[PDB]
Design a protein around this ligand. Structure first.
Ligand SMILES: NC(=O)c1ccc[n+]([C@@H]2O[C@H](COP(=O)([O-])OP(=O)(O)OC[C@H]3O[C@@H](n4cnc5c(N)ncnc54)[C@H](OP(=O)(O)O)[C@@H]3O)[C@@H](O)[C@H]2O)c1
Ligand SMILES: NC(=O)c1ccc[n+]([C@@H]2O[C@H](COP(=O)([O-])OP(=O)(O)OC[C@H]3O[C@@H](n4cnc5c(N)ncnc54)[C@H](OP(=O)(O)O)[C@@H]3O)[C@@H](O)[C@H]2O)c1
Lengths: 352, 351
């Protein structure tokens, strides 16, 4: 059997700036064999779900000095985190029928020649799409960023930006259940309302309807901020610095306001870091897979007990992957942006 | 027994911008009685040596919200670290003839009503002026900053801004002795040459003669920088971040480039901290006086063994303190800036 294998390719490198749909092209003509090559040590996946993640945009720009991940290649499939089902395997740790998450192609079938970076899914009763976010890379990021990087203590005053996002909605709930006071910023009233009801944040505000971020942070933090879970950067970062307490911490998870800027914004008040003895620390979840067992143990139990809430934004079909990715930098995604490529056989779960 | 007590007063608060000599006045008519008051709990000092330190500038500006340290007060003496001799004492832990360091008045005699701020000097064989710098607040800064905040490991690559300055000349040596590759930036060819001969830095450069700081750092760090001891801020930091290695650390000691500017400059590449997993951390020596005893011991041994070098810029006389202080922000000080207010009798040789 040879079968159809649609793909989304990167049409070309793009300059600093925003990505556009037309930087990527769907190809419907491709095909694939349903067995791994003889002599291989490899896994063929049927791909089921794809994650759209903000870090993916930077990969659409050529870098001369190797960054932490390899750039995409013009004319090759876009790649990113997703979930697949093993169709065939010449690697002993993977059997036909296993479900796995890892870096896979923006396509219907991916032949993975380095299986070692696939994670076998051990909990298939949990909806599989969760392994693209909360139980995948995104959730581990929340966990490492909050519990390790932030050094939290009960009672501390915590601010999360992009707080209705995939990372931030998780962070908020961890902080809350840790016994912290928690405030989030988000880009719409719908998000704000989700933060205050569904996610149990103490307060939230719509950053786009604030003419002054410093004063706004001052409203919700009359004694200032202990901990900032930084997802955005820009002027929001300056506003936090101004409102930060002595021995405050900032876990620099990301800086999404800067990713599509020809010209990144200046941060002006870093000297506050001296007199306030602030630690500003970046981290990359790719260094922390060693933590996964402790994390998955904690998060699977929370999910199975309904003591954490999670919101996915689902888009149906490979074809809609590119726009969904672009949507992230406009804040179109409401929750964690997933793309269904093909739903696994015998699903029977309802939705609205 | 009343005597003359000359003082250097803050004339007035100053706005955003650069301080100058004339923001201070020397007054010569005042006098003081050489005993502490009965029932007092105090220590009367004859002040010997005074430190000029960069943080002093910020104290000349009014702050409606409280910085780490009180603003100076117009009409009242300038204060700062120094070294003093106890003339009279109504506080148990201090006796007549003892030597101490701590915050004292810019004047000839200071009656200290908060004696718990003072530290007795236990090595009087070392020149007492050392306790305004290498053995005082300045040395402890270097030691906390490097040994604790920078988390150093044998064989890492270290860059120091204001490297010929007091803090930075100590940092560089601590680092070289820790087995690190060390480079420093300074604002003169003379300072650059001191960093390489006297202070054992591996390389150094005149920031003022580099049109591209990013490229300059790349010349000296072909595989990037592990540790940046940050005394300067601004475009230099930006340049550092561009050249910093995976899991780099920046100990934010201070950002002197920013202290006399109406508009502080913007850092544009802070996002690199995520992708390179950089820790940037401010510290204040004020929080770390618990480390003093062990630090003192360590640096005393280095001095005894001649395993560390130290250069002081010495000015003679209180009247010369104001210029001395201003010089700091122009980089006129060559070494740790000291003012001798009065020498203790019985003495080392200088040139
Ligand atoms: N360090 C790591 O290992 C690591 C791992 C995963 C993610 N990250 C980072 O973590 C952050 C969150 O990613 P996610 O996966 O949780 O994405 P997300 O929050 O699910 O989606 C991105 C969101 O960013 C917000 N946004 C976009 N442009 C913005 C701007 N110019 N100003 C302010 N907000 C803006 C939008 O929310 P609003 O409607 O509220 O604007 C959008 O919904 C990102 O910066 C990402 O790069 C880092
Ligand atoms: N965090 C803390 O607790 C703590 C404690 C003590 C000191 N500090 C900080 O550590 C730093 C060094 O202090 P120090 O006592 O050792 O001072 P210092 O280096 O003895 O003297 C200040 C030096 O700063 C340099 N400089 C002045 N203006 C500059 C500018 N615009 N750009 C670049 N460099 C400039 C000059 O040297 P060049 O010839 O090298 O330009 C000058 O010699 C300061 O930023 C200070 O505020 C922090």
């Amino acid at each position: 059997v040879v079968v159809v294998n649609k793909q989304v390719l990167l049409k070309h490198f793009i300059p600093e700036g925003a990505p556009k749909e037309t930087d990527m092209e769907l190809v419907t003509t491709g095909t694939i064999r349903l067995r791994v090559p003889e002599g291989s040590n490899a896994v063929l996946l049927k791909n089921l779900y794809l994650s759209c993640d903000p870090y993916m945009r930077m990969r659409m720009t050529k870098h001369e000095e190797a960054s932490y991940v390899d750039d995409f290649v013009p004319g090759a499939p876009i790649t990113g985190f997703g979930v697949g089902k093993v169709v065939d395997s010449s690697h002993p740790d993977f059997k036909t029928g296993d479900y796995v998450w890892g870096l896979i192609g923006w396509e219907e079938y991916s032949l993975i020649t380095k299986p070692q970076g696939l994670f076998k899914i051990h909990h298939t009763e949990i909806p599989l799409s969760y392994y693209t976010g909360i139980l995948g890379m995104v959730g581990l990021t929340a966990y490492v960023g909050f519990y390790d990087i932030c050094s939290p203590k009960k009672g501390e005053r915590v601010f999360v930006s992009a707080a209705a996002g995939a990372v931030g909605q998780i962070v908020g709930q961890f902080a809350k259940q840790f016994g912290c006071y928690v405030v989030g910023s988000a880009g719409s009233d719908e998000k704000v309302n989700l933060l205050k009801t569904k996610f149990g944040f103490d307060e939230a505000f719509n950053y786009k309807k604030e003419p002054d971020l410093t004063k706004a942070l001052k409203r919700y933090f009359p004694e200032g901020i202990d901990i900032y879970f930084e997802n955005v950067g820009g002027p929001m970062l300056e506003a936090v610095l101004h409102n930060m307490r002595i021995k405050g911490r900032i876990a620099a998870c990301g800086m999404i306001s800067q990713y599509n800027l020809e010209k990144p914004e200046g941060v002006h008040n870093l000297f506050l870091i001296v007199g306030k003895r602030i630690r500003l620390e970046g981290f990359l979840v790719f260094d922390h897979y060693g933590s996964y067992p402790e994390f998955e143990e904690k998060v699977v139990q929370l999910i199975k007990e309904e003591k954490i809430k999670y919101l996915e934004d689902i888009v149906e079909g490979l074809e809609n992957a590119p726009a969904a990715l672009i949507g992230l930098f406009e804040g179109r995604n409401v929750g964690k942006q997933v793309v269904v490529v093909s739903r696994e056989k015998g699903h029977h779960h309802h939705h609205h």
